[PDB]
Amino acid sequence: NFIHLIIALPVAVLLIVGGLVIMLYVFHRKR
Which amino acid type is present at position 11?
A: V
Give the C-alpha separation, 10 to 3, whole Å: 12
Number of domains in the chain: 1
Which amino acid type is present at position 26?
A: V
Give the CA angle between residues 20, 23, 29 to the nearest 5°: 135
Q: String of b and e for 7-26 (b: at least 16 CB within 10 Å)?
A: eeeeeeeeeeeeeeeeeeee
User: Which H or E run contains 30?
Assistant: none
Give the C-alpha separation, 6 to 26, whole Å: 31
Q: 24 lies in which domain range?
A: 1-31
Residue 1 is classified by DSSP as -
